[PDB]
Design a protein around this nucleic acid. Structure first.
Ligand SMILES: [Mg+2]
Ligand SMILES: [Mg+2]
Ligand SMILES: [Mg+2]
Ligand SMILES: [Mg+2]
Ligand SMILES: [Mg+2]
Ligand SMILES: [Mg+2]
Ligand SMILES: [Mg+2]
Ligand SMILES: [Mg+2]
Ligand SMILES: [Mg+2]
Ligand SMILES: [Mg+2]
Ligand SMILES: [Mg+2]
Ligand SMILES: [Mg+2]
Ligand SMILES: [Mg+2]
Ligand SMILES: [Mg+2]
Ligand SMILES: [Mg+2]
Ligand SMILES: [Mg+2]
Ligand SMILES: [Mg+2]
Ligand SMILES: [Mg+2]
Ligand SMILES: [Mg+2]
Ligand SMILES: [Mg+2]
Ligand SMILES: [Mg+2]
Ligand SMILES: [Mg+2]
Ligand SMILES: [Mg+2]
Ligand SMILES: [Mg+2]
Ligand SMILES: [Mg+2]
Ligand SMILES: [Mg+2]
Ligand SMILES: [Mg+2]
Ligand SMILES: [Mg+2]
Ligand SMILES: [Mg+2]
Ligand SMILES: [Mg+2]
Ligand SMILES: [Mg+2]
Ligand SMILES: [Mg+2]
Ligand SMILES: [Mg+2]
Ligand SMILES: [Mg+2]
Ligand SMILES: [Mg+2]
Ligand SMILES: [Mg+2]
Ligand SMILES: [Mg+2]
Ligand SMILES: [Mg+2]
Ligand SMILES: [Mg+2]
Ligand SMILES: [Mg+2]
Ligand SMILES: [Mg+2]
Ligand SMILES: [Mg+2]
Ligand SMILES: [Mg+2]
Ligand SMILES: [Mg+2]
Ligand SMILES: [Mg+2]
Ligand SMILES: [Mg+2]
Ligand SMILES: [Mg+2]
Ligand SMILES: [Mg+2]
Ligand SMILES: [Mg+2]
Ligand SMILES: [Mg+2]
Ligand SMILES: [Mg+2]
Ligand SMILES: [Mg+2]
Ligand SMILES: [Mg+2]
Ligand SMILES: [Mg+2]
Ligand SMILES: [Mg+2]
Ligand SMILES: [Mg+2]
Ligand SMILES: [Mg+2]
Ligand SMILES: [Mg+2]
Lengths: 296, 159, 23, 171, 208
RNA sequence: GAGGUAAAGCGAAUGAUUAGAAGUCUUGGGGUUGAAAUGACCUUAACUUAUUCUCAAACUUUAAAUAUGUAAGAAGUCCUUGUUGCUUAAUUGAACGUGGACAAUUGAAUGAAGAGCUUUUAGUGGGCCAUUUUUGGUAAGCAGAACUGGCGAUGCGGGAUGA
RNA sequence: CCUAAGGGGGACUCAUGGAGAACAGAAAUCUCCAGUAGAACAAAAGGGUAAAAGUCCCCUUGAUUUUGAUUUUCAGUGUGAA
RNA sequence: GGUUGCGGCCAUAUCUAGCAGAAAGCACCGUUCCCCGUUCGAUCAACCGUAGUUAAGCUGCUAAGAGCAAUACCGAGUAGUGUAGUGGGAGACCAUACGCGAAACUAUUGUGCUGCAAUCU
């Protein structure tokens, strides 16, 4: 016979964590270190590159934090990529690179720093930082926010990192977390990084799987089969997309099939609504009367 | 043996509030302090750097310096028969804007608005605050409120 | 090779409570 | 619906423990047996504290254990149930829906006997679970499993009896 | 050995209990606080009589034991051992100190005994019994009064036994099915919490 | 704004603490000597659950009174735009400013033999008492603290007499 | 007293209870669940700390240089410490 | 209005036990060549969005639910306290005067609100 643990006193003295920590979504330690600004720069904000991965989507946002809540500057989603020519693999490492490049270009379009700070126009996979222009405004400085996602060399968040850096944004970083970093010989093999930028690993998997298991190739790569897209024309898909991303990085919202009021009215039809006090009092009275049958 | 250390007697003063331990809400790090601001001082026990001395816990002062993570606050402390100007470096976790500014700064605006409106109407308005004055005459209606007579009650034991 | 890492913090234990004889 | 596809019971992991009471050559040979059976390098456990009665000391390498998942876990589990001739007790199932048994000789499993190695007994524990346990094990947004989705003793007992045509005693 | 009680009558010092700071403290002379038929149900002994302090004062554990013994002996001798339930309502938790057992240097005393610090109106002893045994129980406490210093009053309680309800509210809650036995005490019905447990615990609850 | 003492609390954490009641497969034991089955029964003792009496200078959710920090304007508020080697992605800010607007109810009360400032030097550095808070001590015309008022340093009327 | 028990980063979560697994029993090791910290943080105590300040791992020397300002004790002197 | 990403305040949001959830989203889910990390592709890493599911997560509703929050002809102007007397009392302590003024208890009510961006039957 052990003591019941979950007493009323246990609940009384319990201190609930922050709402978004109890959801397991925000690391407030890292958030404090990222967001907090030098008090002698007063109202100049720090800008975060929020990078989040869902099971189907890549979300990249440029955010500054304020007391009333975070405020989005620009945002690029992976589902915007089909507009630019990438329809499948919307969560590749290369799709991450494309989303990072798109958000960088879109932010620079919003600011007006398009002609200045074009970025790395010829992606060869070399490590490079956006250098300031003499006698001109400094490049838009942004710090990377990978959230709760673990830091591994080859992770997809650093694809958005490299894309945003190549898009003209100044994002301070090091190359030892990029795919293709040799940890033993501390130098970056830029050829393998460039391979990863243009979907080289996926194309090589297509080629390696096709001659080793055609049935698995048929199930895994269906969309490619009905589009008649082979490995050798994978690279162009990104290279054109790059160009298209640089041609018009502006955000185009999806035309909505229904209005806000129609959406609200449709959703409001479902979801149960709370009972009035009198209703539950009647329920209690019924339960008391209906308890009368087990008097033994 | 006598003990007189830096944080002596701060067992309860420097405690976190009940069910309020742990991480700092981030509005503390988002507030902006400018030279001349009036701030209340309340030491946070969980941040030990830039922490005030126990004297300044509960004191209010003027910001004179702004640094990377801290502000300098001027406090006047009684030393004998005069005040001495004290300059304390405090991280912003132990600092909060004083709410006494916002009441007086609003009364200045209200007086300015009232003055122009009376000026607009070509009349006069009085802006000085007044203490509560004795109440005027009044008439008490007894419809539904005829006086009920009370008497002191006898002594009883209820144990 | 590989060995288990100490998840616990009872460094100056070297014994444990509840471990009472005759129980 | 209680008859949903994602409510399917299936093995999460199998953990093989050999708690040889000492350190040195014998523990090394137990580790060799475990690496032989699983094909994976096992891991050695250190004593949390010192007990003179058991002849162990703190941080002395006592036991060795290994975790296997997938088809190999299934093969090892049925290989061990053959030694038990498919007959466990009701007391062998925990309230959380996991079960275990312990063999006494490792050559009964069906591996070659070596005079240098000798025979070691072995401890088997199977961790049961339905789909969606990753919620409780992932880094971000970790939560708990709903009551109906929880694994319990009765469901595991019935699933074992159905899937292996075995008998669960209770003496 | 023991000084006269006049040396410790008044609450001059702060409470000095047994703790991790004083450990060599003797035991109180009083160890038993409930006497008579302590297992009797609430309905058996409706009448409650209190011995109440009219002093802010300290009562030694020796005096508590002596008065308890006197009252118990008298009431069991006159009315029988099963005619009452006596409860001592003050526990001696304050440690008195003695110095000599030189001069005033290093004069912090050693634990010497125990006393209960009582206020004005604080109940010292309560006796629940039947009505017909009133004059007996009263006379037991009046004798016990002699073992105490200061002024004490014998007050007949308005309530049923040791319950907080008047002798009329208890009958109302009894005929309404709002009271169940709990051994020597009772449990009352609550209109808060799990409805099913409340209904199960009080089957005879005439709900309105 | 700060505070953690008085009070209060313990079917709220920690620690101390009286009494029953109902329950459990490590019940702690005795009997039924059950042929032995640890599988019942009578019992006391453990724990668990909901209760019960009483407590804390070095316990506490709560939480005073008295006491305490700051503010109540012209050195204020607002508008426009000058300076920098600091800051910002910036034409953003930071600080100091030019120019303009708000006139005696110019922004609570009450008082003010006016406010502010400097130099230099005496004596002193044994104290004691009263109310209240308060520590050691059985206590003391004892010893030791807190705030104030006194005596010392002070006569006068009263307490007969008396710092 | 400490080359880490200093510094940075990362991953993990402690005391304890319940239910289970050959030898294994009150105490060896393994598994799941619960677990507001009931542990641990060199040392006396208090405060503080949970995707950490605790446990483990990796890299290190900021336990470095030049001197000013400030806080406590305060005479607003020194010293110590920050 | 729902959902997601990032949040402010940090339980009216937590905890327990049931039930329900259209659309999109989210999620579980499938695989191991590649970067990467493991005793274990469980976590972490990567690939497919292809084979499946709302069972779980998440969300909403239910509960004389625990907790939390708010309110008060609740208790109570009680306890305490600032100030006063050549007040009472041997004392312990108490009453009164001018002020300030609790906590527990009791009852009732409520159970996240909201900012930026994107999206949806
Ligand atoms: Mg981090
Ligand atoms: Mg000492
Ligand atoms: Mg001291
Ligand atoms: Mg405080
Ligand atoms: Mg330090
Ligand atoms: Mg300081
Ligand atoms: Mg006017
Ligand atoms: Mg340790
Ligand atoms: Mg051994
Ligand atoms: Mg004393
Ligand atoms: Mg005695
Ligand atoms: Mg008497
Ligand atoms: Mg104190
Ligand atoms: Mg008290
Ligand atoms: Mg008290
Ligand atoms: Mg209380
Ligand atoms: Mg017997
Ligand atoms: Mg301008
Ligand atoms: Mg001007
Ligand atoms: Mg006023
Ligand atoms: Mg002078
Ligand atoms: Mg002089
Ligand atoms: Mg002088
Ligand atoms: Mg002099
Ligand atoms: Mg002199
Ligand atoms: Mg003298
Ligand atoms: Mg002298
Ligand atoms: Mg007096
Ligand atoms: Mg007086
Ligand atoms: Mg004296
Ligand atoms: Mg006087
Ligand atoms: Mg003299
Ligand atoms: Mg005089
Ligand atoms: Mg005279
Ligand atoms: Mg005289
Ligand atoms: Mg006289
Ligand atoms: Mg450390
Ligand atoms: Mg370190
Ligand atoms: Mg470290
Ligand atoms: Mg860390
Ligand atoms: Mg040094
Ligand atoms: Mg000194
Ligand atoms: Mg100094
Ligand atoms: Mg000084
Ligand atoms: Mg100095
Ligand atoms: Mg100094
Ligand atoms: Mg609405
Ligand atoms: Mg909270
Ligand atoms: Mg759907
Ligand atoms: Mg996987
Ligand atoms: Mg992964
Ligand atoms: Mg669902
Ligand atoms: Mg569902
Ligand atoms: Mg409720
Ligand atoms: Mg409730
Ligand atoms: Mg008074
Ligand atoms: Mg008189
Ligand atoms: Mg009064």
């Amino acid at each position: 016979m052990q003591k019941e643990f979950r007493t009323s006193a246990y609940h009384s003295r319990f201190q609930t964590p922050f709402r978004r920590r109890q959801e397991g979504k925000t690391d407030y330690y890292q958030r404090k270190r990222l967001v907090t600004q030098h008090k002698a720069k007063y109202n100049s904000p720090k800008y975060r590159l929020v990078v989040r991965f869902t099971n189907k989507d890549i979300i990249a946002q440029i955010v500054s934090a304020h007391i009333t809540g975070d405020v989005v500057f620009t945002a690029a989603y992976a589902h915007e990529l089909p507009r630019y020519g990438i329809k499948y693999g919307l969560t590749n490492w290369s799709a991450a690179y494309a989303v990072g490049l798109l958000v960088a270009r879109r932010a620079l379009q919003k600011l007006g720093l398009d002609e200045t700070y074009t970025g790395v126009e010829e992606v060869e996979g070399e490590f490079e930082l956006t250098e300031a222009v003499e006698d001109g405004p400094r490049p838009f400085k942004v710090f990377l926010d990978i959230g709760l996602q673990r830091t591994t060399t080859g992770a997809r968040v650093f694809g958005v990192l490299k894309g945003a850096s190549d898009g003209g944004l100044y994002v301070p970083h090091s190359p030892n977390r990029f795919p293709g970093w040799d940890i033993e010989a501390e130098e970056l093999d830029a050829e393998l990084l460039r391979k990863y930028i243009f979907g080289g690993h996926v194309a090589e998997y297509m080629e390696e799987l096709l001659d080793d298991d055609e049935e698995k190739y048929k199930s895994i790569f269906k969309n490619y089969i009905e589009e008649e897209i082979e490995s050798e024309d994978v690279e162009e898909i990104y290279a054109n997309a790059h160009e298209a991303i640089r041609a018009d990085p502006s955000f185009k919202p999806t035309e909505k099939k229904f209005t806000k009021e129609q959406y609200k009215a449709e959703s409001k039809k479902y979801r149960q609504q709370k009972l009035t006090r009198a209703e539950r009092q009647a329920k209690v009275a019924k339960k008391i009367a209906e308890f009368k049958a087990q008097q033994e | 043996g006598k003990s007189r250390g830096y944080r002596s007697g701060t067992r309860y003063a420097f405690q976190r509030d009940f069910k309020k331990h742990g991480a700092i809400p981030l509005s503390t790090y988002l507030k902006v302090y400018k030279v001349g601001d009036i701030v209340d001082i309340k030491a946070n026990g969980s941040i030990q750097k830039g922490m005030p001395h126990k004297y300044y816990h509960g004191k209010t002062g003027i910001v004179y310096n702004v640094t990377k993570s801290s502000v300098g606050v001027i406090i006047n402390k009684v030393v004998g028969n005069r005040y001495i100007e004290k300059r304390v470096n405090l991280r912003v976790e132990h600092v909060k804007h004083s709410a006494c500014r916002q009441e007086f700064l609003n009364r200045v605006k209200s007086n300015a608005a009232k003055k122009r409106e009376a000026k607009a109407n070509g009349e006069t308005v009085y802006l000085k605050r007044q203490a509560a004055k004795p109440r005027g005459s009044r008439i008490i209606s007894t419809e539904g409120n005829i006086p009920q007579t009370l008497a002191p009650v006898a002594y009883e034991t209820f144990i | 090779k590989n060995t288990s890492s100490k998840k616990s913090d009872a460094a100056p234990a070297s014994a444990d409570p509840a471990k009472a004889k005759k129980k | 619906k209680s008859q949903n596809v994602m409510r399917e019971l299936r093995i999460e992991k199998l953990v093989l423990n050999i708690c040889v009471g000492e350190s040195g050559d014998r523990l090394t040979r137990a580790a060799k047996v475990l690496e032989q059976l699983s094909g994976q390098t096992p891991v050695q456990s250190k004593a949390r504290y010192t007990v003179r009665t058991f002849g162990i000391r703190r941080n002395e390498k006592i036991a060795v254990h290994v975790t296997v998942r997938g088809p190999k876990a299934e093969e090892i589990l049925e290989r061990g149930l053959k030694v038990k001739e498919y007959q466990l007790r009701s007391k062998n199932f925990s309230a959380t829906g996991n079960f275990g048994f312990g063999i006494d000789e490792h050559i009964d499993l069906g591996i070659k006997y070596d005079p240098s190695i000798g025979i070691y007994g072995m401890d088997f524990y199977v961790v049961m679970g339905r789909a969606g346990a990753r919620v409780t094990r992932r880094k971000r947004a970790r939560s708990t499993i709903g009551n109906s989705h929880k694994t319990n003793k009765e469901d595991t007992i019935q699933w074992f009896k159905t899937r292996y045509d075995a008998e669960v005693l209770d003496k | 050995a023991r000084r006269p009680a006049r040396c410790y009558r008044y609450c001059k010092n702060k409470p000095y209990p047994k703790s991790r700071y004083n450990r060599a403290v003797p035991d109180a002379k009083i160890r038993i606080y409930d006497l008579g038929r302590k297992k009797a149900t609430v309905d058996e002994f409706p009448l409650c009589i209190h011995l109440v302090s009219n002093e802010l004062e300290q009562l030694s554990s020796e005096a508590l034991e002596a008065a308890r013994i006197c009252a118990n002996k008298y009431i069991t001798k006159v009315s029988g051992r099963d005619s009452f339930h006596l409860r001592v309502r003050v526990h001696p938790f304050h440690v008195l100190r003695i110095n000599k057992m030189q001069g005033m240097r290093g004069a912090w005393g050693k634990p010497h005994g125990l006393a209960a610090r009582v206020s004005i109106g604080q109940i010292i002893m309560s006796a629940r019994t039947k009505d017909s045994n009133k004059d007996v129980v009263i006379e037991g406490l009046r004798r016990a009064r002699y073992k105490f210093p200061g002024q004490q009053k014998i007050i007949i309680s308005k309530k049923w036994g040791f319950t907080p309800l008047n002798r009329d509210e208890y009958i109302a809650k009894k005929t309404n099915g709002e009271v169940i036995d709990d051994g020597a005490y009772v449990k009352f019905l609550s209109r808060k919490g799990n409805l099913e447990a409340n209904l199960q615990q009080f089957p005879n609850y005439q709900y309105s």
